[PDB]
Swiss-Prot record:
The chain holds residues 126 to 398 of 398 of the full protein. This is Beta-1,4-galactosyltransferase 1. Residues 6-272 are lumenal. Signal peptide: none annotated. One of its GO terms (molecular function) is galactosyltransferase activity. The keyword Membrane applies. It is linked to Congenital disorder of glycosylation 2D: A multisystem disorder caused by a defect in glycoprotein biosynthesis and characterized by under-glycosylated serum glycoproteins. Congenital disorders of glycosylation result in a wide variety of clinical features, such as defects in the nervous system development, psychomotor retardation, dysmorphic features, hypotonia, coagulation disorders, and immunodeficiency. The broad spectrum of features reflects the critical role of N-glycoproteins during embryonic development, differentiation, and maintenance of cell functions. Changing residue 188 to G: Reduction in N-acetylglucosamine binding.
């Protein structure tokens, strides 16, 4: 019964998952130690199973600016999880250059476009750097519909702010992201960019996929520095096709590949 054969696809659900995890942010993290503890993660924070092929080719995009301690906790907790989930993944920290108002959604668009230059990713997880999953059955990859991953956040009492809430951590396949023309580029701290994204999905006929709440619990990291739904539905319809990936403009000032992640420093301009 011999002959040349391809590696099998990885199983529908990984047999390596452990379920609940204790998430704490009160101890120091040393990334050199984390790298040594995750020897299979390659330069730039890249990993893929050795014994099976994953259909999940995921770029994990993290909007960022001056929050190194949070990022260290993020890397410490997620790398082991992402490997147990048997994903073919890469970590991208999109660092906003300058001191102008932070623009989360625009940095996510940057991450989508830059990660694609590195590899043919077909799934994108957009994650704030201060959100950590409490259960590894919460899959960091894409589904038949846009996926909302951080569904029961401790900062919100482990309950969804509202059924249309799409903030924190989410995942869109390449097809899903492209069809909504990505995310809006003009929410300069205005708040509600996630609601605009939700409106884009609905308008294109998509719905929200969510893991069961029991495994969707996430912890939020506090920093020395419940949400309500913003409207702008009519604005989204009017603006989505002219404001997003197609109109995205930015300058890449630095690209650093570290053992556990790639950091792309970009100048995304100032509010126009
Ligand atoms: Mn926060």
């Amino acid at each position: 019964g011999r002959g040349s054969a391809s590696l099998p696809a990885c199983p529908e659900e990984s047999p390596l998952l452990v379920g609940p995890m204790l998430i704490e942010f009160n101890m120091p993290v040393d990334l050199e130690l984390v790298a040594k503890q995750n020897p299979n993660v390659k330069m730039g924070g890249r990993y893929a199973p050795r014994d099976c092929v994953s259909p999940h080719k995921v770029a994990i995009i993290i909007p960022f600016r001056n929050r190194q301690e949070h990022l260290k906790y993020w890397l410490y907790y997620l790398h082991p999880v992402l490997q147990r989930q048997q994903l073919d993944y890469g970590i991208y920290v999109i660092n906003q250059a300058g001191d102008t108002i932070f623009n989360r959604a625009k940095l996510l668009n940057v991450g989508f476009q830059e990660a694609l230059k590195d590899y043919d990713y077909t799934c994108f997880v957009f994650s704030d750097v201060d959100l950590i999953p409490m259960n590894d059955h919460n899959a960091y990859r894409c589904f038949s519909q846009p996926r909302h991953i951080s569904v029961a956040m401790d900062k919100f009492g482990f309950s969804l702010p509202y059924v249309q809430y799409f903030g924190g951590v989410s995942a869109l396949s390449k097809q899903q992201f492209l069809t909504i023309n990505g995310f809006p580029n003009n929410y300069w701290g205005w708040g509600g960019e996630d609601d605009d994204i939700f409106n884009r999905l609905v308008f294109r006929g998509m719905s929200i996929s969510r893991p069961n709440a029991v495994v969707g619990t996430t912890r939020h990291i506090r920093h020395s520095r419940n949400p309500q739904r913003f409207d702008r539905i009519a604005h989204t319809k009017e603006t989505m096709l002219s404001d997003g990936l197609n109109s995205l403009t930015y300058q890449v000032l630095d690209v650093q590949r570290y053992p556990l992640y790639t950091q792309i420093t970009v100048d995304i301009g100032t509010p126009s």
